[PDB]
Amino acid sequence: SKDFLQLKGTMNAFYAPKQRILSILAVNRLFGATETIDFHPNLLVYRQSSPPVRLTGDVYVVDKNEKVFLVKHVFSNTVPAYLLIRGDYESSSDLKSLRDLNPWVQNTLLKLLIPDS
Amino acid sequence: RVNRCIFASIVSFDACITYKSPCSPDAYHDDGWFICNNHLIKRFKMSKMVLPIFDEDDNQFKMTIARHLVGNKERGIKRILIPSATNYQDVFNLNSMMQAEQLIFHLIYNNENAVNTICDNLKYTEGFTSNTQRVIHSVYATTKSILDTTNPNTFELRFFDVTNARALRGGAGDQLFNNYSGFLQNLIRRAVAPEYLQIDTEELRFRNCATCIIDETGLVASVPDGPELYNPINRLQIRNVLKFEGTLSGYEEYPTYVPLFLGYQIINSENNFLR
Amino acid sequence: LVPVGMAPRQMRVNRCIFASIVSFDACITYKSPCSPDAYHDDGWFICNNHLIKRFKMSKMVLPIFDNQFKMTIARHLVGNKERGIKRILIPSATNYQDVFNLNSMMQAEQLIFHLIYNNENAVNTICDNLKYTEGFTSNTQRVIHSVYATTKSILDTTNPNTFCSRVSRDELRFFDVTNARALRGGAGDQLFNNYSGFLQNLIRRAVAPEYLQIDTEELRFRNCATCIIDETGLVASVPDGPELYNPIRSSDRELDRTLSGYEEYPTYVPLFLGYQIINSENN
Amino acid sequence: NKVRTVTEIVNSDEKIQKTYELAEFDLKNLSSLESYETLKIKLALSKYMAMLSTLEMTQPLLEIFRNKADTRQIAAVVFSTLAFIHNRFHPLVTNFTNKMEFVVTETNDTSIPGEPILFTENEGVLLCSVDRPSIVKMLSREFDTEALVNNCNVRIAKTFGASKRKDFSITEVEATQYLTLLLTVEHAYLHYYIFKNYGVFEYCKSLTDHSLFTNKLRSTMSTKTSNLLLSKFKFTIEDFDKINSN
Amino acid sequence: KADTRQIAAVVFSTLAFIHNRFHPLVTNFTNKMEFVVTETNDTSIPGEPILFTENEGVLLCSVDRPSIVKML
Amino acid sequence: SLESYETLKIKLALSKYMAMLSTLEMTQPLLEIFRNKADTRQIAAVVFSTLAFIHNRFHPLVTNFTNKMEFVVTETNDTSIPGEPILFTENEGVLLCSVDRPSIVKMLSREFDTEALVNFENDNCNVRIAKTFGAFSITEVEATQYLTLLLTVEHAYLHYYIFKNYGVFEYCKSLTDHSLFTNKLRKTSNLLLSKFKFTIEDF
Ligand SMILES: [Zn+2]
């Protein structure tokens, strides 16, 4: 939909500007994208919060130094996915290793994170 | 300005080592303590406190008391506050502390063999006779003077194991208290508050249950039974930048402390003795 | 007119029930003494002044934690030598009429008590007597209706949440002596049930639990209980033996030379009794 | 303008001289006075709105004045405003003593330009005449809620010193309506005061020329009474001189 | 433009560095400091991309980030 | 030299005030104490101790001093008088001491011209060079703040002495007119306000 744009080089990753959200479909492909946007760190705007914003469910650490996390999220219409967030966050439960994630999301994350030097 | 800061009479006899001695000012207070607050905290996990008893007009009985610095998860050695002479060497990592501090501890526990061993080892320091022996003399004399001062036998009805309901029999915590040195006994008296205070046939109860435990291992911040009491505790950075400029706040707070409450103090016909 | 049609406005609200006390004799002006704390939107529905005056209790906070949670707690104002009825910190529905001197206090406060304690007979008696007493119609009737409406509004705010808490699974509280091997504890939960919903809320806000199990972590605030509950109600008594000394230093030289600025442990006696359990934080 | 201070020790002659520019304190004083006056005026306006609410009339002000039938509410509002102004001049007065009559004109040949509210005795008691059509016209005229109104140095200094902060049907439009009504009733009250205290002939002369207000009022107003609402600002007619020459 | 945090950090660090260079004994700035990043010409003042104004309680530093970007 | 000896005496008096402050044993500097409104008790104790110190100095033979005083820390503008941050009223037999905490905080927070001004001093480069070849602290700003507070309380204490010795009527009249103590010393010598002069001129 027009609410977001598919990230270049990804079949299951998109970004919603008005929401400032990067999302990765758990098991689903994107389709119909006539446009794509190059990934860039600015997209992961650091969320400011005097007390760390609490998070629930499955949480994974991407960059402890940069407060980057991956949060399991299901769209109310029951669409599984993960949200990549950067900011002052804390986890209600124990943080989980990324290896737990499926190869699909893992490949997308590698593409999005490792700079193409 | 007598500095009673036992464990600050420590001199880094090693040239390469400098002892900061960053310890609490209260050592210059002519109190019943022979060890000031920071030494107490560091080496016994205790924080000095005072408990007023009568504070109406001028009767200002202010019994002293220290607080646990032990959480509700530590156990065994981690929980022991004042170890016995049989286990203090183990509880304290003497090897990790300066030999002068080790000497102080050995003197406190009357480990003359360890004292002799330490001075024998110091015998083989490069500047041994020059200044190592002078440091030995200074530290040893200071510690001995403090110990003699504490010891009452030199030149009253406080019972520490007599509070423990549900105990099978025996007490003997007072036995070990007797076995302790004068300095250790005075420290225990100064820091531990008897749960009961009887004056001329007048009993005051401060707690419904004692908080400390005394046994062969020594003084332990343990409970008489059940689980342990809950005991909680610029370099501008990017994170230090705050975001946009923009719940019982109105009520006072009861401390989440665990003061040393244990024992029964009996006072004879003597009235409200305030000297 | 200025305001939008209806449009219920938003402002602060005095919360202590006793703030509504007013002399039914309109020709006699009266002002009740209210502590400013009454204007804090908190679980307390009684101000410090009324609490101390009627229940012998003082509010207090207990920090809890990483994130420092503040748990409400009250403390004893009961002296060591007080005995018998004096030890009733909060009377039960079967004893409040006696513990509180209805005769000595105002009719409005008597109605407030007969409302808090579910005494419909006494409430009706007072209402009818006021109907047939003084110039009821002129303004006394409206004043009585206002006081009754305020009390009923507070009670209707509290009781539904109280019942939901009672049947709640996630949050559980047990007002008894955690030392089951004791005789002064008894069916504290049954007595708490006997209490009214609003009274139950007050008890929850006042008495902290001896232990508190959050999810998997348990915090033991006491190795003992500082108060008990019996048929008489909340009693400021030691379940095991001698009463705790309560100096009451306020309200109703070498020693200091050594004891200059120096941490001091308060002599207050907070309320610790019973077991509490919670899932997640819910804070 | 400016001042300077000299510090010196009694036994020593080494003196330190500092200079101060009074413009800073002038800015402080002006800002304080402006804030105080704004607060006073807003307090008075809120009080007026609140008492009108206390009267508890269902309709809003403009609707009330549009409802020609309900003369009762028009009279109530007018009298309440007049009494409020009277008290604002004589705080110890909370009533109006002599009863008051009211009439609501409905035609140009019944209204007098420039004095929508006026007074005249029936030789026994005072009657207040109201030009409800004119009141409605004033309160209905579209208001500007956008444009601002106004030494550049002190202006900039205030701009950089003073700060800014970023369920009532009242908008600035309704506040303006209330202020306009208050000012009109204040003018009428001044006319009535001159009447009562200087005779009907003096009242007529004042109507002819308001300038007499100067003495006839300042004799008592500026000394004992709260300043006129208009006192908050100095008003002037655009191109007044050329218009007069016209 | 999004990461105002870093802009404020850099600006304050530079300001403190200059302040110390004038007063070497000073390593902090005492009173807390506010920061705002303008984004429009009608919000920026020519010739003073960085400026200061108190809110009557504490000083606020105004930054013309577009002008800074243009210069650099 | 001589003037240097009087300077040393004045600095010794300041040091005695420092001993009084240490006796009070405040964790925070007076600036932070005054900035913290919640520290009402600390502010009152500071003021009372300063007043007692000034009383002892002004009456060396007298060690007595009012051991209890009502205190009120004011914050609102309408609760303060320009030029008299400290006031001594009486509530029908009750002696009230009003404090203008915002004014105190403002004075303390004012930047001082420590470096800005250059003043004469013992300065011999030969001595400096000879020394070079032979080879808890208080800053100047803190000392200035501390002097300012001491002198403020000195003014307040003089007004208080007028109040007690003459009465509330004369205390108010002194507040209106301060000409009474142009002479000052006439006891007073131990008061720093008698050590220097300050004047204002049209300019
Ligand atoms: Zn109240």
Swiss-Prot record, chain A:
This is Protein AC142. The chain holds residues 359 to 475 of 477 of the full protein. It comes from the Viruses. Keywords: Host cytoplasm, Host nucleus, Virion. The keyword Membrane does not apply. Required for occlusion-derived virus (ODV) envelopment and subsequent embedding of virions into polyhedra. One of its GO terms (cellular component) is host cell cytoplasm. The keyword tRNA-binding does not apply. Transmembrane segments: none annotated. It is found in: Host cytoplasm; Host nucleus; Virion. Its main location: host cell.
From Swiss-Prot, chain B:
It is found in: Virion. InterPro entries: Baculo_VP39. Its main location: virion. Keywords: Capsid protein, Late protein, Virion. GO terms for molecular function: structural molecule activity. One of its GO terms (cellular component) is host cell nuclear matrix. Pfam families: Baculo_VP39 (PF04501). Most abundant structural protein of the nucleocapsid produced during the infection cycle. The monomers are arranged in stacked rings around the nucleoprotein core. Belongs to the baculoviridae major capsid protein family. Expressed late in infection. This is Major capsid protein. It comes from Autographa californica nuclear polyhedrosis virus (AcMNPV).
Curated annotation (Swiss-Prot), chain F:
Transmembrane segments: none annotated. Disulfide bonds: none annotated. It is found in: Virion membrane. It comes from the Viruses. Coiled coil: none annotated. One of its GO terms (biological process) is symbiont-mediated perturbation of host cell cycle progression. Keywords: Host-virus interaction, Membrane, Modulation of host cell cycle by viral cyclin-like protein, Modulation of host cell cycle by virus, Viral envelope protein, Virion. One of its GO terms (cellular component) is membrane. Belongs to the baculoviridae E27 family. Interacts with host mus209/PCNA, cdc2 and cdk6. Forms a complex with proteins C42 and p78/83. Acts as a cyclin-like protein and plays a role in the modulation of host cell cycle. May promote G2/S arrest by interacting with host mus209/PCNA, cdc2 and cdk6. The cell cycle arrest is characterized by an intact nuclear envelope, concomitant with sustained activity of host cdc2. However, viral DNA replication still occurs in the arrested cells. This is Occlusion-derived virus envelope protein E27. The chain holds residues 38 to 271 of 290 of the full protein.
